[PDB]
Design a protein around this ligand. Structure first.
Ligand SMILES: O=c1ccn([C@@H]2O[C@H](COP(=O)(O)OP(=O)(O)O)[C@@H](O)[C@H]2O)c(=O)[nH]1
Ligand SMILES: *[C@@H]1O[C@H](CO)[C@@H](O)[C@H](O)[C@H]1NC(C)=O
Ligand SMILES: [Ca+2]
Length: 284
Protein backbone atom coordinates (compact mmCIF):
# COMPACT_ATOMS: atom_id res chain seq x y z
CA UNK A 1 0.00 0.00 0.00
CA UNK A 2 3.03 2.37 0.30
CA UNK A 3 3.69 1.65 -3.44
CA UNK A 4 -0.04 2.14 -4.22
CA UNK A 5 -0.25 5.45 -2.30
CA UNK A 6 3.00 6.91 -3.67
CA UNK A 7 2.78 5.61 -7.26
CA UNK A 8 -0.62 4.01 -8.10
CA UNK A 9 -2.58 0.72 -7.71
CA UNK A 10 -1.62 -0.26 -11.33
CA UNK A 11 1.85 0.57 -12.68
CA UNK A 12 2.51 -0.13 -16.36
CA UNK A 13 5.66 0.47 -18.42
CA UNK A 14 6.10 0.30 -22.19
CA UNK A 15 8.62 1.13 -24.90
CA UNK A 16 7.84 2.86 -28.23
CA UNK A 17 10.18 3.98 -31.05
CA UNK A 18 8.64 5.62 -34.10
CA UNK A 19 5.56 7.74 -34.72
CA UNK A 20 3.49 4.65 -35.58
CA UNK A 21 4.35 2.98 -32.22
CA UNK A 22 3.79 6.27 -30.35
CA UNK A 23 0.33 6.56 -31.98
CA UNK A 24 -0.41 2.97 -30.81
CA UNK A 25 1.06 3.69 -27.35
CA UNK A 26 -1.51 6.50 -26.72
CA UNK A 27 -4.24 4.05 -27.84
CA UNK A 28 -2.89 1.37 -25.44
CA UNK A 29 -2.99 3.86 -22.54
CA UNK A 30 -6.55 5.00 -23.39
CA UNK A 31 -7.66 1.33 -23.55
CA UNK A 32 -6.22 0.66 -20.04
CA UNK A 33 -8.02 3.70 -18.55
CA UNK A 34 -11.39 2.88 -20.21
CA UNK A 35 -11.27 -0.53 -18.39
CA UNK A 36 -10.29 0.40 -14.84
CA UNK A 37 -11.41 2.67 -11.99
CA UNK A 38 -8.17 1.93 -10.04
CA UNK A 39 -5.34 4.51 -9.99
CA UNK A 40 -2.81 4.08 -12.84
CA UNK A 41 0.73 5.34 -13.40
CA UNK A 42 2.49 4.84 -16.76
CA UNK A 43 6.27 4.62 -16.91
CA UNK A 44 8.15 5.46 -20.13
CA UNK A 45 11.59 4.54 -21.44
CA UNK A 46 12.29 8.19 -22.20
CA UNK A 47 15.22 8.16 -24.64
CA UNK A 48 13.25 6.48 -27.48
CA UNK A 49 10.36 8.94 -27.45
CA UNK A 50 9.87 11.92 -29.76
CA UNK A 51 9.70 15.49 -28.40
CA UNK A 52 6.05 15.73 -29.53
CA UNK A 53 5.02 12.59 -27.58
CA UNK A 54 6.69 13.86 -24.39
CA UNK A 55 4.99 17.26 -24.86
CA UNK A 56 1.57 15.62 -25.34
CA UNK A 57 1.75 13.13 -22.39
CA UNK A 58 0.66 15.80 -19.71
CA UNK A 59 -2.48 16.38 -21.84
CA UNK A 60 -3.18 12.62 -22.04
CA UNK A 61 -2.57 12.39 -18.25
CA UNK A 62 -5.07 15.16 -17.43
CA UNK A 63 -7.70 13.89 -19.92
CA UNK A 64 -7.54 10.22 -18.94
CA UNK A 65 -6.71 10.74 -15.25
CA UNK A 66 -3.38 8.94 -14.86
CA UNK A 67 0.01 9.73 -13.36
CA UNK A 68 3.26 9.22 -15.34
CA UNK A 69 7.03 9.19 -15.07
CA UNK A 70 9.91 9.26 -17.57
CA UNK A 71 12.83 6.90 -16.84
CA UNK A 72 16.19 7.48 -18.57
CA UNK A 73 18.59 4.66 -17.71
CA UNK A 74 22.05 4.48 -19.32
CA UNK A 75 23.20 1.10 -20.76
CA UNK A 76 26.04 -0.07 -18.46
CA UNK A 77 29.44 0.06 -20.19
CA UNK A 78 30.41 -3.47 -19.11
CA UNK A 79 27.28 -5.01 -20.67
CA UNK A 80 27.42 -6.12 -24.34
CA UNK A 81 25.67 -3.53 -26.55
CA UNK A 82 23.16 -4.12 -29.35
CA UNK A 83 23.96 -2.34 -32.63
CA UNK A 84 20.39 -2.91 -34.00
CA UNK A 85 17.88 -0.40 -32.50
CA UNK A 86 15.22 -3.18 -32.32
CA UNK A 87 17.52 -5.33 -30.15
CA UNK A 88 18.52 -2.38 -27.93
CA UNK A 89 14.80 -1.68 -27.30
CA UNK A 90 14.34 -5.39 -26.43
CA UNK A 91 17.24 -5.06 -23.97
CA UNK A 92 15.44 -2.18 -22.23
CA UNK A 93 12.37 -4.42 -21.76
CA UNK A 94 14.12 -7.30 -19.98
CA UNK A 95 17.60 -6.40 -18.66
CA UNK A 96 16.95 -3.48 -16.26
CA UNK A 97 13.73 -4.34 -14.37
CA UNK A 98 15.40 -3.81 -10.97
CA UNK A 99 17.03 -0.44 -11.83
CA UNK A 100 14.44 1.43 -13.97
CA UNK A 101 11.96 1.77 -11.09
CA UNK A 102 12.20 3.12 -7.52
CA UNK A 103 12.67 0.72 -4.56
CA UNK A 104 9.26 2.02 -3.28
CA UNK A 105 7.47 0.42 -6.31
CA UNK A 106 6.42 -3.18 -5.49
CA UNK A 107 5.15 -4.29 -8.92
CA UNK A 108 5.11 -3.18 -12.55
CA UNK A 109 3.57 -4.64 -15.70
CA UNK A 110 5.05 -4.38 -19.21
CA UNK A 111 2.27 -3.84 -21.81
CA UNK A 112 3.33 -3.67 -25.47
CA UNK A 113 2.84 -0.28 -27.21
CA UNK A 114 0.73 -1.94 -29.93
CA UNK A 115 -1.62 -3.62 -27.41
CA UNK A 116 -5.31 -3.13 -26.88
CA UNK A 117 -6.42 -3.77 -23.27
CA UNK A 118 -9.96 -5.11 -22.66
CA UNK A 119 -9.71 -5.80 -18.92
CA UNK A 120 -9.05 -4.20 -15.54
CA UNK A 121 -5.27 -4.47 -15.23
CA UNK A 122 -5.59 -4.56 -11.43
CA UNK A 123 -6.63 -8.28 -11.99
CA UNK A 124 -3.01 -8.89 -13.15
CA UNK A 125 -1.62 -7.00 -10.12
CA UNK A 126 -3.70 -9.40 -7.92
CA UNK A 127 -2.82 -12.59 -9.86
CA UNK A 128 -0.89 -14.99 -7.63
CA UNK A 129 2.65 -15.71 -8.84
CA UNK A 130 3.43 -18.52 -6.31
CA UNK A 131 6.86 -17.07 -5.56
CA UNK A 132 7.85 -16.36 -9.22
CA UNK A 133 9.47 -12.93 -9.74
CA UNK A 134 7.54 -12.54 -13.04
CA UNK A 135 4.62 -13.97 -15.02
CA UNK A 136 4.22 -14.23 -18.83
CA UNK A 137 1.44 -15.73 -20.99
CA UNK A 138 2.30 -18.76 -23.13
CA UNK A 139 2.30 -18.68 -26.93
CA UNK A 140 -1.04 -20.01 -28.19
CA UNK A 141 -1.35 -23.47 -29.79
CA UNK A 142 -5.09 -23.00 -30.73
CA UNK A 143 -4.56 -21.82 -34.38
CA UNK A 144 -3.70 -25.32 -35.74
CA UNK A 145 -2.95 -24.10 -39.30
CA UNK A 146 0.06 -22.11 -38.01
CA UNK A 147 1.85 -25.18 -36.48
CA UNK A 148 4.67 -25.04 -39.07
CA UNK A 149 5.65 -21.55 -37.83
CA UNK A 150 5.73 -22.58 -34.10
CA UNK A 151 9.56 -22.87 -34.03
CA UNK A 152 9.45 -23.65 -30.27
CA UNK A 153 7.55 -26.93 -30.85
CA UNK A 154 10.52 -28.58 -32.74
CA UNK A 155 14.37 -28.45 -32.85
CA UNK A 156 16.38 -26.53 -30.23
CA UNK A 157 13.48 -25.18 -28.17
CA UNK A 158 11.48 -28.44 -28.01
CA UNK A 159 14.52 -30.25 -26.60
CA UNK A 160 15.52 -27.39 -24.25
CA UNK A 161 12.04 -26.73 -22.78
CA UNK A 162 11.24 -30.35 -21.79
CA UNK A 163 7.51 -29.63 -22.14
CA UNK A 164 7.61 -26.23 -20.37
CA UNK A 165 5.74 -23.41 -22.18
CA UNK A 166 7.47 -21.03 -24.58
CA UNK A 167 6.15 -17.64 -23.31
CA UNK A 168 5.36 -14.51 -25.36
CA UNK A 169 7.08 -11.25 -24.22
CA UNK A 170 4.31 -8.83 -25.24
CA UNK A 171 2.93 -8.66 -21.70
CA UNK A 172 4.45 -9.54 -18.33
CA UNK A 173 3.91 -8.77 -14.64
CA UNK A 174 7.01 -8.30 -12.50
CA UNK A 175 6.76 -8.56 -8.69
CA UNK A 176 9.67 -6.09 -8.23
CA UNK A 177 9.89 -6.96 -4.46
CA UNK A 178 10.51 -10.68 -5.39
CA UNK A 179 12.65 -9.89 -8.47
CA UNK A 180 14.95 -7.80 -6.16
CA UNK A 181 14.73 -10.52 -3.46
CA UNK A 182 16.02 -12.99 -6.08
CA UNK A 183 18.81 -10.88 -7.74
CA UNK A 184 16.99 -11.69 -11.02
CA UNK A 185 18.21 -8.47 -12.65
CA UNK A 186 21.91 -9.19 -12.01
CA UNK A 187 21.44 -12.83 -13.08
CA UNK A 188 19.57 -11.93 -16.32
CA UNK A 189 22.30 -9.33 -17.19
CA UNK A 190 25.15 -11.88 -16.65
CA UNK A 191 23.37 -14.65 -18.64
CA UNK A 192 22.56 -12.20 -21.45
CA UNK A 193 26.19 -10.97 -21.46
CA UNK A 194 27.59 -14.51 -21.78
CA UNK A 195 24.96 -15.73 -24.31
CA UNK A 196 25.18 -12.65 -26.55
CA UNK A 197 28.90 -13.40 -27.29
CA UNK A 198 27.37 -15.75 -29.96
CA UNK A 199 25.47 -13.51 -32.45
CA UNK A 200 23.20 -16.48 -33.40
CA UNK A 201 21.91 -16.74 -29.75
CA UNK A 202 18.81 -14.91 -28.37
CA UNK A 203 17.24 -14.19 -31.82
CA UNK A 204 14.13 -12.81 -30.05
CA UNK A 205 16.15 -11.17 -27.19
CA UNK A 206 13.25 -10.06 -24.89
CA UNK A 207 11.38 -13.37 -25.28
CA UNK A 208 14.22 -15.94 -25.52
CA UNK A 209 16.07 -14.75 -22.37
CA UNK A 210 13.28 -15.32 -19.75
CA UNK A 211 12.27 -18.58 -21.54
CA UNK A 212 15.92 -19.76 -21.39
CA UNK A 213 16.20 -18.86 -17.67
CA UNK A 214 12.83 -20.34 -16.55
CA UNK A 215 14.42 -23.38 -14.81
CA UNK A 216 16.35 -21.02 -12.38
CA UNK A 217 14.35 -17.71 -12.50
CA UNK A 218 10.82 -19.09 -12.37
CA UNK A 219 8.07 -17.84 -14.62
CA UNK A 220 4.48 -18.02 -13.42
CA UNK A 221 2.62 -19.11 -16.64
CA UNK A 222 -0.26 -16.64 -16.83
CA UNK A 223 -3.71 -17.80 -18.00
CA UNK A 224 -3.80 -17.96 -21.81
CA UNK A 225 -6.53 -15.30 -21.93
CA UNK A 226 -4.04 -12.64 -20.74
CA UNK A 227 -2.51 -12.39 -24.24
CA UNK A 228 -4.27 -13.07 -27.57
CA UNK A 229 -2.61 -12.60 -31.01
CA UNK A 230 -4.27 -13.60 -34.30
CA UNK A 231 -1.12 -15.25 -35.64
CA UNK A 232 -1.14 -18.00 -32.99
CA UNK A 233 -4.58 -17.85 -31.38
CA UNK A 234 -7.90 -19.09 -32.78
CA UNK A 235 -10.77 -16.74 -33.66
CA UNK A 236 -12.89 -18.67 -31.10
CA UNK A 237 -10.67 -17.54 -28.17
CA UNK A 238 -10.77 -13.80 -29.00
CA UNK A 239 -13.98 -13.28 -26.96
CA UNK A 240 -12.10 -14.42 -23.80
CA UNK A 241 -9.01 -12.22 -24.47
CA UNK A 242 -8.17 -9.77 -21.70
CA UNK A 243 -5.52 -8.04 -23.96
CA UNK A 244 -4.69 -8.18 -27.68
CA UNK A 245 -1.20 -8.00 -29.18
CA UNK A 246 -0.83 -7.17 -32.89
CA UNK A 247 2.11 -9.58 -33.40
CA UNK A 248 3.60 -10.23 -36.86
CA UNK A 249 2.01 -12.94 -38.99
CA UNK A 250 4.81 -14.68 -40.94
CA UNK A 251 2.30 -16.25 -43.36
CA UNK A 252 0.43 -13.06 -44.39
CA UNK A 253 2.89 -10.24 -43.69
CA UNK A 254 -0.22 -7.87 -43.45
CA UNK A 255 0.74 -4.30 -42.39
CA UNK A 256 0.50 -3.25 -38.70
CA UNK A 257 -2.26 -0.59 -39.05
CA UNK A 258 -4.31 -2.87 -41.32
CA UNK A 259 -4.14 -5.67 -38.62
CA UNK A 260 -5.19 -3.11 -35.96
CA UNK A 261 -8.26 -1.76 -37.83
CA UNK A 262 -9.36 -5.20 -39.10
CA UNK A 263 -9.01 -7.16 -35.82
CA UNK A 264 -10.05 -4.61 -33.19
CA UNK A 265 -13.37 -2.72 -33.68
CA UNK A 266 -12.63 -0.14 -30.95
CA UNK A 267 -9.17 0.74 -32.34
CA UNK A 268 -10.48 3.54 -34.63
CA UNK A 269 -12.60 4.85 -31.71
CA UNK A 270 -9.50 5.28 -29.48
CA UNK A 271 -7.48 6.69 -32.42
CA UNK A 272 -10.20 9.30 -33.22
CA UNK A 273 -10.63 10.16 -29.51
CA UNK A 274 -6.90 10.87 -29.07
CA UNK A 275 -6.87 12.89 -32.35
CA UNK A 276 -9.92 14.86 -31.02
CA UNK A 277 -8.00 15.57 -27.76
CA UNK A 278 -4.96 16.68 -29.85
CA UNK A 279 -7.12 19.14 -31.88
CA UNK A 280 -8.67 20.48 -28.63
CA UNK A 281 -5.24 21.16 -27.05
CA UNK A 282 -3.86 22.66 -30.31
CA UNK A 283 -6.56 25.37 -30.54
CA UNK A 284 -6.08 26.33 -26.87
O1 LIG B 1 8.69 0.53 -30.98
C1 LIG B 1 8.85 -0.14 -32.00
C2 LIG B 1 8.69 -1.56 -32.10
C3 LIG B 1 8.91 -2.18 -33.27
N1 LIG B 1 9.30 -1.50 -34.40
C4 LIG B 1 9.59 -2.22 -35.66
O2 LIG B 1 8.39 -2.82 -36.12
C5 LIG B 1 8.69 -4.10 -36.72
C6 LIG B 1 7.83 -5.19 -36.11
O3 LIG B 1 8.06 -5.32 -34.70
P1 LIG B 1 6.83 -5.48 -33.67
O4 LIG B 1 7.30 -5.21 -32.29
O5 LIG B 1 5.67 -4.73 -34.18
O6 LIG B 1 6.50 -7.04 -33.81
P2 LIG B 1 5.57 -8.06 -32.89
O7 LIG B 1 6.45 -8.40 -31.70
O8 LIG B 1 4.36 -7.23 -32.52
O9 LIG B 1 5.24 -9.26 -33.75
C7 LIG B 1 10.20 -4.29 -36.63
O10 LIG B 1 10.81 -3.89 -37.86
C8 LIG B 1 10.59 -3.35 -35.48
O11 LIG B 1 11.93 -2.86 -35.57
C9 LIG B 1 9.47 -0.13 -34.39
O12 LIG B 1 9.81 0.50 -35.37
N2 LIG B 1 9.22 0.47 -33.18
C1 LIG C 1 -16.28 2.44 -12.66
O1 LIG C 1 -17.30 2.88 -11.75
C2 LIG C 1 -18.58 3.15 -12.36
C3 LIG C 1 -19.49 3.60 -11.24
O2 LIG C 1 -20.80 3.91 -11.71
C4 LIG C 1 -19.09 1.91 -13.08
O3 LIG C 1 -20.30 2.21 -13.77
C5 LIG C 1 -18.04 1.36 -14.06
O4 LIG C 1 -18.49 0.14 -14.63
C6 LIG C 1 -16.72 1.14 -13.33
N1 LIG C 1 -15.70 0.65 -14.25
C7 LIG C 1 -14.87 -0.36 -13.95
C8 LIG C 1 -13.92 -0.76 -15.03
O5 LIG C 1 -14.88 -0.91 -12.85
CA1 LIG D 1 3.50 -6.29 -30.08
Amino acid sequence: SVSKTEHAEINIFSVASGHLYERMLNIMMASVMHHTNHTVKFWFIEQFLSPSFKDFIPHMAAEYGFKYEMVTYKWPHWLRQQKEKQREIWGYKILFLDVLFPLSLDKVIFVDADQIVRTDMYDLVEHPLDGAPYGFAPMCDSRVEMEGYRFWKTGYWANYLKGKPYHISALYVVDLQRFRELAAGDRLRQQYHALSADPNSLANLDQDLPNHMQFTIPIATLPQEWLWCETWCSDETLKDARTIDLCNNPMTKEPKLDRARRQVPEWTKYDEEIAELARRVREG
